[PDB]
Design a protein around this ligand. Structure first.
Ligand SMILES: *[C@@H]1O[C@H](CO)[C@@H](O[C@@H]2O[C@H](CO)[C@@H](O)[C@H](O)[C@H]2NC(C)=O)[C@H](O)[C@H]1NC(C)=O
Ligand SMILES: N[C@@H](CCC(=O)O)C(=O)O
Ligand SMILES: N[C@@H](CCC(=O)O)C(=O)O
Lengths: 496, 92
């Protein structure tokens, strides 16, 4: 039970998948945690927004599970009930939980759904940075949940358009169970039916940590050699599990992945042989150089706020500390993460945007509900969640925090469904100079903009994700002898 | 009070017992009035009250049984996986 607490009049909750829970999620979780911390530090360091009030932190680990995230949100919310509850002999201090002004977090769709259902009972606004599921779009079940990322049907139709551009009619798909994978694969199936794309096998996996199911799914995928394109729609953990299972077997599918995989280094780092022409897509974004320089200067003896940072150093650099002194070597004093060590996560700026959106909502409430002063007052002592959310969060419109370009996309706007702009960057896991690495090959905002010449397919050939033949109805027909969707040619007589 | 918000507040009072155990340090000792762990909630007149209380108790795996909520919105076990009733649904 590791917690991050900073004293302040208004505290923002933190939900990150630090531990993937025994193994630390290096690229996603801790980087997002540091992004939120850096954004809050910048908010507290500038007097233009929220000058007087200090923004505390309450960061908790979700362990990429719905139940653990629910427990952490219970820990978050055990502050309003404490005030109404404490008599006793002499006095009781212990550790009074701080009233959470708003919750910033909710990676993975299940965590976001559970935490939103929890906070709808306490009118606590929640802003997500990575939950791109369509089940949270509706404001009826989740009337205090919003996000800086687009919903899931945009991603599903982008995947369908990617399949259609290369004429991948006969594809196989594997989806994750829960709230993200199921809804997203339903939307993708609807889009494929609209665009006349036939799915060979519809497989679903689970977070049971059993590789037998994953290798059985791989074998089932192998049962349809015609569908050489796999539209993989799952979480990072499930994507890694299927990559490991396919590496155990002999698979060469071109995984058309989703935001769950995206441009991730750990999933490929498990095994790079299975994935060579995987057309993945992630949320389109620009790396933050200020957070880059903030994270590069981070050291195990410099950032003592994070209880996971020492273990993060130990896991990333494989060197143990003086606590063990026998399992591994000793980390060098000159060791750093300055260059050629880490790659910026594409959702870091989304975390920064969510934090700054909450901060700007609080600043606007202060400028409206607490006039004549820039510090805390009686009106700001108690925050009205419904008013704050609906007014200063659903109608918010502010420029990007760290973007010198100041382009059109450098604006954080919350739509009627509390979502973000539908922009996706399509990467391919190709090799350019002998070292495997993702690089952007296309874009999707309203229509595909793809670079075929810079794809570098697996097996150095364009995949043929089609059945035996599309057939010619002019002088033949179809009967569907063995497959529900595929067909074959039967010549038609001139008098028929 | 035949209202959803008041019923939500009363269910919050109901549920403020499991969090107390995991939460209490202090000088000497603190007694006050320790809330009792609710084994199950019997109540939920009117559909709004039942829906709000079921949504509250689904987070604490506290079974709820209603006596008068005959609404069809509570029939599904996906949104309300700990809510039940002794009365027929609304489409009948
Ligand atoms: C995908 O299928 C479409 C439909 O056939 C292809 O579009 C035409 O393909 C023929 C050759 O098969 C060309 O002569 C035409 O110039 C194409 N017209 C257009 C508007 O594209 C398309 O070439 C196929 N794309 C791939 C990557 O296979
Ligand atoms: N958008 C996905 C992925 C979340 C993440 O990568 O943290 C969910 O749902
Ligand atoms: N079944 C109605 C009426 C409840 C009552 O009369 O208490 C509701 O919903």
């Amino acid at each position: 039970r590791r917690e991050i607490k900073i004293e302040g009049d208004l505290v923002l909750g933190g939900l990150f998948p630090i531990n993937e829970c025994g193994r630390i999620n290096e690229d996603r979780g801790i980087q997002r945690l540091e992004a939120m911390l850096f954004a809050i530090d910048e908010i507290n360091k500038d007097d233009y927004l929220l000058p007087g009030v200090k923004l505390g932190v309450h960061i908790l680990d979700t362990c990429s599970r719905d139940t653990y995230a629910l427990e952490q949100s219970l820990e978050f919310v055990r502050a309003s009930l404490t005030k109404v509850d404490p008599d006793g002999s002499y006095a009781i201090q212990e550790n009074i939980p701080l009233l959470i002004a708003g919750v910033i977090g909710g990676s993975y769709s299940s965590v976001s759904i559970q935490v939103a259902n929890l906070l709808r009972l306490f009118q606590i606004p929640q802003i997500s940075y990575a939950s791109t599921s369509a089940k949270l779009s509706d404001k009826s079940r989740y009337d205090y949940f919003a996000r800086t990322v687009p919903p899931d049907f945009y991603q599903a139709k982008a995947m369908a358009e990617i399949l259609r551009f290369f004429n991948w009619t006969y594809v196989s798909t594997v989806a994750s169970e829960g709230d993200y994978g199921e809804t997203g694969i339903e939307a993708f199936e609807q889009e494929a039916r609209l665009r006349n794309i036939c799915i060979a096998t519809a497989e679903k996996v689970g977070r049971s940590n059993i590789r037998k199911s994953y290798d059985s799914v791989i074998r089932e995928l192998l049962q349809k050699p015609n569908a050489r394109v796999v539209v993989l729609f799952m979480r990072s953990d499930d994507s890694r599990e299927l990559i490991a299972a396919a590496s155990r077997a002999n698979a060469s599918f071109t995984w058309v992945a989703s935001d769950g995989w995206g441009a991730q280094e750990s999933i490929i780092k498990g095994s790079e042989h299975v994935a060579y022409g995987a057309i993945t897509l992630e949320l389109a974004s620009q790396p933050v150089r200020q957070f880059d320089r903030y994270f590069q200067s981070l050291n195990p003896y410099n950032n003592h706020r994070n209880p996971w940072f020492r273990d993060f150093w130990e896991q990333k650099f494989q060197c143990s500390l003086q606590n063990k002194r026998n399992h591994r070597r000793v980390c060098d004093k000159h060791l750093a993460i300055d260059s050629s060590n880490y790659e910026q996560e594409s959702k870091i700026m989304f975390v920064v945007n969510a934090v700054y959106a909450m901060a700007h909502a609080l600043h606007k409430m202060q400028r409206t509900l607490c006039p004549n002063t820039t510090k805390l007052c009686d009106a700001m002592k108690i925050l009205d969640g419904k008013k704050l959310y609906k007014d200063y969060l659903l109608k918010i419109n502010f420029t990007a925090p760290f973007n010198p370009n100041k382009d059109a996309d450098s604006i954080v706007k919350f739509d009627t469904f509390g979502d973000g702009m539908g922009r996706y960057n399509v990467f391919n896991f190709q090799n350019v100079g002998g070292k495997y690495s993702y690089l952007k090959v296309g874009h999707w905002a309203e229509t595909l903009s793809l670079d075929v010449n810079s794809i570098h397919w697996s097996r150095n050939s364009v995949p043929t994700s089609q059945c035996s033949d599309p057939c010619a109805p002019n002088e033949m027909k179809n009967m569907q002898p063995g497959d529900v969707c595929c067909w074959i040619c039967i010549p038609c007589e001139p008098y028929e």
